[PDB]
Design a protein around this nucleic acid. Structure first.
Lengths: 621, 656, 233
RNA sequence: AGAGAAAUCAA
RNA sequence: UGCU
């Protein structure tokens, strides 16, 4: 590692990077040999001038672009590896310093450049001696003999000789101290060489059992699941408002409205209606963001962490034990089928207004026609209106959840029909949100219009009576803290249309493939297991229910739903296999339903899917 | 669920994509990972023996076990040594061309690997600041640490980096002086090298329970990179590997091969239960050693390939913030050992906040090497079928003559994977005897058709930055989705329309907005999609830039064309952008001891970017430091200028 | 030229301000080219960033601050409507500038509107994906020789004899003729990106029912599918 | 309160 | 403060 005393520090520093010495056989020796060659080049090219220019310029151990520049001016070019060490301007010839232990082997290396062979002990080859001046020979001899006692002082002889003999070889070295560290947690050496004789033992295994009947998913028991989604969904309604901006509609509603509670829940106190009215007034006077009132503490849970922690500390009793978290088991609520029916109800408006893309090829026309017909199928539906409401609400909630405001913000859920009339779906109420992480929950006070009131379906929503020009509507009011990522992903709820579109598109294109002409009007008969028996139904209705069920699976998405679907994909595949009159075999300890039954706890749509699966034939024979 | 099972005109497998949750929040993991990581660590000790004997099982250094110790009923952790030797020999004997490519990689491509590619990695725990950092920052920290401790300059090659890591370990004391100096011992540096930083795996789908992911340290990432490049080189040439290159043609071809009618077919689609926590690093050591020995590779190659797994056997997995303990309503965060729990067996392995774990592995590491361990097992004379392996998911094809012999082959497949520590899930593996219905990775196979089904829906939203680049990004993502078979005519066009609507809204151009109301009040007619005009793209036009289309169809005319593409515009003055520089190609407006270092590195990058025009086309390969290289290039570029020599020396006089 | 003194002064400033930084190895550039403490994605914040009162950061130039009550300059940051102001009542450039500022885009567009399409006919075809060249190139250039071709095109002086040898001749001269106007109008990074995109032969997995030429392989998301196939010229 | 699901948010 |  230390620099030899006979080599200048500049040459050593230049050598430090010129080649990778540490990963080569016999390191710290090839570097010294190359330093010797560079020193020879420097001594030959030392303060010698010809035609007003230096006689020798060294093409070695310097930036390559300089070599190409100098060679370009000299009408010569050299590739990378046979690069001459130095070039003589007086004679217009190039040389490479090439040390050899033996001098008898003249061995002209190449015709591109001549060689300057100087042995280790000092004597030069006859050609290189007769082509160079006396002083160069003498001082190269001095440098080489000095290197000679440097070698013999630390007996570098044989490895220097083999360095001269041939090209470098790459090696990797593991030390003795690292080797002991490496073997602390293993029974073998660095290179494992077990003494066992290679063989494959014949282990006795079990048998493969056929799935003669499809598994039956376990329907759970307990209180019916409430409606835990962010918004009402199928039970949502809108209030028609005169055309104008959002502030105009809010002003109209606030001016013509009377509020009276009809059902007050313990989860959402009826006293938080003051916050909603104050925010309506604020957003009607042109200030979306308003100050904090006393009821906001209860409405948004201000300082609820500290007081609950204090209560827990005061009520502390017993001994520390490992945390046991319990997820309450719930059964299938009866309102899932009601939501399925209501979400399929036909609306007057299209509720899906997406700008048509351009058309240039005949292929583009087919795709646009299919998309337009799909929009016609699932557009004039309640589920489309709920999707639009969710899109608007999530976007308006997310756009105001970017700073760290400590004051209440108003995000009305207002949509506009093609005529221009505003539609009051509801309202979202941001609380003080000092959010720092995308996972953190932001307090909200969701106020929105019901269509029907059911205490069992909405145990936490407070119901109020609203009078708007001789028309009465219900008004939801629920306290909910909802995260940033969920609001972001619900701001793109329109992506749910892809899967029903995929199914409809594949059906239409299968018809197009079976015949030799696209139709775009085909509405075939889809056979399904409806109410246990097998009754067919039309494609337009089937796609319409698929959209509603996918929307419910999207707004109700959690570890339970994703685990249920992931572990039910293989059972769906097995059912298809048995439909094709095929045999399904399983290994010894195989209980596929156990992977699914663990995901059925309290999710309403997981329970609904499980009931739908159970209402299907178990054996196909 | 009966709605997702059509009985006519369309297959239940064709409606398989309805069983997904594209739209909807992906679950996020909350709180400590300590319980999850301790559960992951305890599994290899639980299933090492037929009966749970964790306390005695916490004495095994090499996971070698006798054949009668293998659990044929439940999961089995560990491997049979002679089985590994024979299976590796069989995997070498067949697929010999695949191993020939490995020889060329070792002899030619391996020495040319640079450690700069280590900066293109995940977040890496830094032993200097004891905190997660981006990969380039940790890489330069470690390189500087080695330079200060080894009194030498680290070579650009990856082999040089690994050699530096090897030699730094024999030093009794190591320092990182430089205002900020911290000491290390050989044991402390060894522990830091062994330490595996673990964190929750976020935004993961298809699971009820959250898993954790462990990442290596920069002291071992070079060795891991070498081994994984070798594993990828092998796997890219074997027919049985379902890695990103194999998943395209292998499954589709296996779904299209004809079979003799008298023969008996069969597909086994399944998942490997407890894949990460059952394999032992010594099995990979032994397989790699057999591979290198049968290639005639030198001993230093063997040592280089063996160091990563040997360090893995000494891993100190980071538990995390501790276990959760309750005293009624309040909760506390407590480490393992302070109070009794269900992981009291592993208390003796607690080293500081980390825990020792010899048996078993962790996810996020040695993904490709684990695939190799699952393919040497298939190399048996009884197993005459076709196998495709991709990490913990696999599909197998049986071509037999009798059902009994098919079941014998299936059981042989189940047990041969157990000889190396790979237990397929009993409740997740399904065998279809008559013909082809199966699933692999994300694809779903039915008869001659294989249909790729996406796990995550493409983000049909602008990716930020500017309208011109993210419009192209969205169109390219939709095109990629269509090309993979996930989408088609109508689905692709609908995704295009949804993305276009979100694009027009995301730049405040839909409805009555301030920008919009500005356009019709200044008589600024809209010409571009981001301006709210009609869309110029179509399904057949996802690969074309907007402005060229609008010029060709005569939308941007000519006068507006000159003005928007003027290079001297006030507003203005990277992998597949393919967008023109225009006025709409703008940008938006957005431990502390590192910021100045970032700015210094950025300025040195800027000076290199201009003086060296060749540093963008290829990688910087030139001996010397930045100072001398830049100075010599400045001198060279000045001396080649058209200026006379007196101006040349005038310019050179001010260089210092 | 003033560029030489600009480089000299920037070099002196870098040496003065960053002593230790300049002492790093030149080959470390591939490591510290990406040194940044910045990491999901701006896609989750773009909707609010655009609606920020002063979203666009604009360099000082000649822009009117108030037009029809515009308040579009605060003296820096700009307004979201100044790109649209730069589309009418602004400054124009030469026709050659706009013709050369985009060349590969024009080539891709013209190839689209130059091929007649037959009658699309549907069937039960099963498409299998082969790796085919992504887009047509001006000349057939091997993937290994693309960096050397770019080196010859952009910086011939900073090359080496064997770099010239393993560089595909012929394509270099055409790349020069087509990139001479583009280089002077756009940045060097943009120029090299466009040039490589012109010469890159990247094999990408694409649906395939019949053998695809690069011209056909460029446009494949709509020519063939599992239910339809239209035959080109 | 609440969101939520094996443990966090309610700075 | 205006995405069907």
């Amino acid at each position: 590692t230390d620099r030899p005393d006979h080599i200048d520090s500049r040459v050593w520093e230049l050598s430090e990077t010129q080649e990778d010495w540490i990963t080569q056989v016999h390191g710290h020796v090839r570097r010294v040999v190359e330093c010797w060659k560079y020193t020879i080049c420097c001594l030959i090219s030392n303060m010698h001038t010809h035609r007003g220019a230096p006689q020798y310029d060294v093409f070695k151990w310097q930036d390559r672009s300089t070599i190409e520049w100098i060679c370009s001016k000299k009408k010569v070019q050299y590739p990378e590896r046979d690069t001459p060490d130095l070039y003589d301007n007086e004679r217009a010839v190039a040389y490479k310093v090439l040390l050899v232990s033996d001098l008898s082997d003249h061995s002209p290396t190449s015709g591109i450049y001549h060689d300057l062979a100087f042995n280790l002990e000092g004597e030069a080859e006859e050609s290189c001696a007769l082509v160079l001046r006396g002083s160069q020979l003498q001082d190269i001899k001095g440098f080489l003999c000095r290197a000679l006692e440097w070698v013999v002082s630390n007996n570098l002889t044989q490895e220097v000789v083999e360095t001269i003999s041939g090209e470098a070889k790459l090696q990797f070295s593991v030390g003795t101290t690292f080797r002991t560290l490496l073997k602390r947690d293993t029974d073998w050496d660095v290179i494992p060489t077990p003494r066992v004789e290679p063989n494959v033992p014949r282990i006795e295994g079990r048998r493969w059992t056929q799935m003669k009947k499809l598994p039956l998913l376990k329907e759970k028991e307990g209180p019916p699941s409430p409606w835990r989604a962010l918004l009402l969904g199928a039970d949502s309604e809108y209030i028609v408002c005169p055309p104008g901006t959002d502030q105009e509609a809010i002003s109209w509603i606030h001016s013509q409205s009377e509020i009276e509670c009809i059902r007050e829940s313990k989860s959402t106190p009826a006293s938080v209606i003051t916050c909603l009215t104050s925010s309506l007034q604020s957003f009607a006077e042109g200030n979306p963001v308003r100050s904090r009132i006393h009821e906001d503490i209860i409405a948004f849970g201000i300082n609820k962490k500290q007081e609950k922690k204090q209560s827990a500390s005061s009520s502390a009793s017993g001994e520390w034990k490992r945390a046991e978290y319990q997820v309450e088991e719930m059964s299938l609520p009866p309102w899932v089928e009601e939501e399925m029916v209501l979400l399929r109800s036909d609306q007057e408006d299209n509720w899906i207004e997406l700008e048509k893309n351009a058309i240039y090829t005949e292929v583009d026309g087919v795709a646009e026609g299919l998309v337009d017909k799909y929009i016609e199928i699932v557009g004039r539906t309640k589920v489309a209106s709920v999707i639009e409401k969710w899109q608007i609400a999530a976007t308006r909630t997310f756009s105001q959840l970017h700073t760290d405001r400590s004051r209440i913000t108003a995000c009305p859920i207002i949509t506009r029909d093609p005529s221009g009339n505003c539609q009051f779906w509801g309202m979202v109420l941001l609380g003080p949100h000092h959010v720092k992480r995308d996972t953190d929950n932001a307090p909200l006070l969701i106020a929105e219009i019901m269509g029907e009131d059911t205490e069992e379906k909405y145990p936490k929503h407070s119901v109020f009576s609203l009078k708007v020009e001789e028309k009465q509507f219900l008004l939801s009011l629920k306290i909910t803290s909802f995260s940033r990522n969920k609001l972001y992903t619900f701001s793109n709820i329109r992506r749910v249309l892809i899967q029903p579109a995929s199914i409809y598109s594949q059906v239409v294109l299968s018809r197009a493939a079976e015949n030799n002409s696209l139709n775009l009007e085909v509405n075939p008969e889809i056979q399904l297991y409806l109410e246990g028996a097998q009754r067919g139904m039309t494609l337009y209705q089937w796609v319409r229910m698929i959209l509603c069920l996918e929307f419910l699976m999207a707004i109700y998405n959690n570890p339970q739903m994703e685990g249920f679907l992931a572990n039910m994909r293989r059972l769906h595949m097995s059912r298809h296999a048995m439909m094709e009159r095929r045999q399904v075999f399983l290994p010894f300890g195989s209980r596929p339903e156990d992977k699914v039954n663990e995901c059925i706890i309290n999710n309403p749509i997981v329970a609904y899917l499980a009931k739908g699966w159970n209402s299907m034939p178990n054996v196909y024979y | 669920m009966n709605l997702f099972t059509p009985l006519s005109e369309i297959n239940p497998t064709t409606t398989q994509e309805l069983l997904y949750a594209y739209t909807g929040p992906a679950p996020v993991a909350y709180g400590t990972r300590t319980r999850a990581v301790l559960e992951n660590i305890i599994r290899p000790y639980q299933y090492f023996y037929k009966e749970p004997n964790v306390q005695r099982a916490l004495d095994i250094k090499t996971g070698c076990k006798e054949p009668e110790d293998i659990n044929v009923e439940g999961p089995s952790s560990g491997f049979h040594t002679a089985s590994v030797l024979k299976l590796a020999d069989n995997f070498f004997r067949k697929y010999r061309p695949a191993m020939e490519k490995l020889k060329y990689w070792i002899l030619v491509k391996l020495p040319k690997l640079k450690y700069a590619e280590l900066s293109k990695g995940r977040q890496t725990y830094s032993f200097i600041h004891k905190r997660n950092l981006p990969a380039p920052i940790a890489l330069e920290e470690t390189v500087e640490f080695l330079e200060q401790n080894l009194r030498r300059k680290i070579g650009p090659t990856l082999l040089s980096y690994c050699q530096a890591i090897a030699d730094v370990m024999e030093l009794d004391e190591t320092t990182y002086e430089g205002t900020y100096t911290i000491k290390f011992s050989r044991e402390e540096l060894w522990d830091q090298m062994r330490t595996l930083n673990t964190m929750w795996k976020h935004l993961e789908r298809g699971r009820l329970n959250r898993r954790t992911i462990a990442t290596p340290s920069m002291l071992i990432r070079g060795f891991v990179k070498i081994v994984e490049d070798a594993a990828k080189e092998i796997l890219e040439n074997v027919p049985t590997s379902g890695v990103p290159v194999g998943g395209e043609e292998k499954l589709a071809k296996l779904a299209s091969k004809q079979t003799f009618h008298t023969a008996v077919t069969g597909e086994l689609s399944g998942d490997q239960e407890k894949f990460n926590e059952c394999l032992d690093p010594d099995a990979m050591r032994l397989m790699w050693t057999v591979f290198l020995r049968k290639l005639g590779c030198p001993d230093w190659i063997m040592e280089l390939f063996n160091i990563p797994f040997m360090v893995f056997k000494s891993k100190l997995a980071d538990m995390g913030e501790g276990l959760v303990y309750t005293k009624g309503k309040l909760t506390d965060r407590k480490p393992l050992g302070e109070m009794p729990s269900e992981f009291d067996d592993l208390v003796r392995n607690v080293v500081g906040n980390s825990i020792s774990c010899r048996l078993g592995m962790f996810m996020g590491m040695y993904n490709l090497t684990s695939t190799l361990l699952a393919l040497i097992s298939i190399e048996r004379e009884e197993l005459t079928g076709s196998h495709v392996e991709s990490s913990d998911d696999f599909i197998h094809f049986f071509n037999c003559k009798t059902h009994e012999e098919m079941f014998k082959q299936a059981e042989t497949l189940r047990l041969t994977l157990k000889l190396v520590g790979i237990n397929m899930s009993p409740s997740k593996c399904i065998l279809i005897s008559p013909a082809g219905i199966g699933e692999f990775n994300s694809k779903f196979h039915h008869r001659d058709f294989v249909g790729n089904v996406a796990t995550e829906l493409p983000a049909l939203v602008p990716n930020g930055t500017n309208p011109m680049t993210d419009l192209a990004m969205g169109l390219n993502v939709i095109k990629h989705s269509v090309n993979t078979g996930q989408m088609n005519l109508c689905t692709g066009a609908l995704a295009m329309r949804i993305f276009n609507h979100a694009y027009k809204y995301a730049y405040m151009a839909l409805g009555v907005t301030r920008r919009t109301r500005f356009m019709e009040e200044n008589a600024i007619t809209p010409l571009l999609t981001n301006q709210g005009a009609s869309p110029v793209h179509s399904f057949s036009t996802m690969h074309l830039d907007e402005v060229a289309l609008r010029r060709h169809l005569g939308l941007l005319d000519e006068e507006t064309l000159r003005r928007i593409l003027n290079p001297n515009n006030p507003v203005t003055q990277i992998m597949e952008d393919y967008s023109v520089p225009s006025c709409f190609k703008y940008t938006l407006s957005r431990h502390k001891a590192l910021l100045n270092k970032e700015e210094r590195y950025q300025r040195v990058t800027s000076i290199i970017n201009k003086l060296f025009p060749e540093v963008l086309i290829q990688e910087a390969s030139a001996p010397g430091t930045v100072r001398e290289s830049l100075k010599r290039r400045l001198e060279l570029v000045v001396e080649r200028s058209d200026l006379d020599e007196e101006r040349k020396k005038r310019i050179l006089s001010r260089i210092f | 030229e003033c560029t030489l003194r600009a480089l000299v002064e920037e070099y002196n400033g870098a040496c003065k301000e960053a002593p230790k930084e300049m002492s790093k190895q030149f080959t470390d550039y591939n490591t510290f080219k990406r040194y940044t403490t910045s990491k999901h994605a701006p896609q989750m914040r773009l909707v609010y960033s655009v609606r920020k009162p002063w979203p666009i950061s604009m360099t000082p130039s000649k822009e009117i601050p108030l037009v029809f009550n515009g308040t579009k300059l605060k003296d820096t940051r700009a307004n979201i409507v100044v790109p649209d102001y730069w589309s009418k009542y602004g400054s124009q450039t030469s026709l050659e500038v706009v013709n050369a500022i985009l060349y590969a885009e024009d080539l891709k567009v013209q190839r689209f509107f130059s091929t007649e399409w037959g009658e699309i006919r549907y069937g039960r075809m099963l498409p299998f994906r082969k790796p085919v060249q992504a887009c047509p190139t001006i000349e057939e250039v091997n993937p290994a020789s693309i960096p050397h071709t770019l080196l010859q095109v952009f910086c011939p002086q900073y090359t080496t004899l064997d770099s010239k040898r393993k560089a595909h001749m012929g394509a270099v001269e055409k790349l020069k003729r087509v990139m001479e106007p583009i280089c002077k109008v756009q940045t060097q990074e943009s120029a090299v990106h466009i040039a490589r995109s012109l010469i890159d032969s990247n094999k990408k997995w694409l649906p395939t029912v019949v053998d695809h030429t690069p011209r056909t392989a460029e446009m494949a998301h709509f020519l063939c599918s599992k239910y339809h196939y239209v035959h080109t010229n």
